[PDB]
């Protein structure tokens, strides 16, 4: 990789600088380079990795949705056909999005997940594996869609099992995992009843654990709880 000659600490420093500069493509390249140094990531460094790639793939997902909508309307009844250009460009963005997912999934599989020696690190990485298979699922169609969906499910489910055994119900990684698995169920797997049930149980069990938290931890937990509540309002 082009980051092979840079020190680990310098890559982390520059990832933080790129975040300040809103240069998320740079930030992701720096964090990829830091991961490839082969050392385990701290909590802060894991978050830097996630922020970088989530911003990169988020821009791609937003573009793909814009383009896919245009494409669907140029294929409606009575809507003239302006040639191949919309499909071509949607495919270009799709392929770039798929390459980003492939890159992240590759970092997780070589070798973040296997070396993760804590519940908190292993759940974080397994949640990320589920997330990036979900992003692949959003654009998948033929004959591989079902297997991509089940790869996302398998990852989320293992993370869920560990988080329930090893973390308290208010743990922000546990909460964000459950949130994202509920979104998987609702938006990807056509399982709205599972999504609702998970979000309700997640919210109620966290509510009953808030009393154990400091103000600092209480703030982190309740932010994600409000997202669970917001989704339940949409879904019910």
């Amino acid at each position: 990789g082009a980051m092979g000659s840079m020190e680990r600490a310098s890559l982390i420093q520059k990832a933080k600088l790129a975040e300040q500069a809103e240069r998320y493509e740079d930030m992701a390249a720096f964090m990829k380079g830091a991961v490839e140094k082969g050392e385990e990531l701290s909590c802060e460094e894991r978050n830097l990795l996630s922020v970088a790639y989530k911003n990169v793939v988020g821009g791609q997902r937003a573009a793909w949705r814009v383009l896919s909508s245009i494409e669907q309307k140029s294929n409606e009844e009575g809507s003239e056909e302006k040639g191949p250009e919309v499909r071509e460009y949607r495919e270009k963005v799709e392929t770039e999005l798929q390459g980003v997912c492939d890159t992240v999934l590759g970092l997780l599989d070589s070798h973040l997940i296997k070396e993760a020696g804590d519940a908190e690190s292993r759940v974080f990485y397994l949640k990320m594996k589920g997330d990036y298979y979900r992003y692949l699922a959003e654009v998948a169609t033929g004959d591989d869609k079902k297997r991509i969906i089940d790869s996302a499910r398998s990852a989320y489910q293992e993370a869920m099992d560990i988080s329930k055994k090893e973390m308290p119900p208010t743990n922000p990684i546990r909460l964000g995992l459950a949130l994202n698995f509920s979104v998987f169920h609702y938006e990807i797997a056509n399982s709205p009843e599972e999504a609702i049930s998970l979000a309700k149980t997640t919210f109620d069990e966290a509510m009953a654990d808030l009393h154990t938290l400091s103000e600092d931890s209480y703030k982190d937990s309740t932010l994600i709880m409000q997202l669970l509540r917001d989704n339940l309002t949409l879904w019910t």
Binding site: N47, K54, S182
Partner: peptide
Amino acid sequence: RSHSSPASLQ
């Protein structure tokens, strides 16, 4: 759309 988690998690 449904809301998913923010990128950074404590």
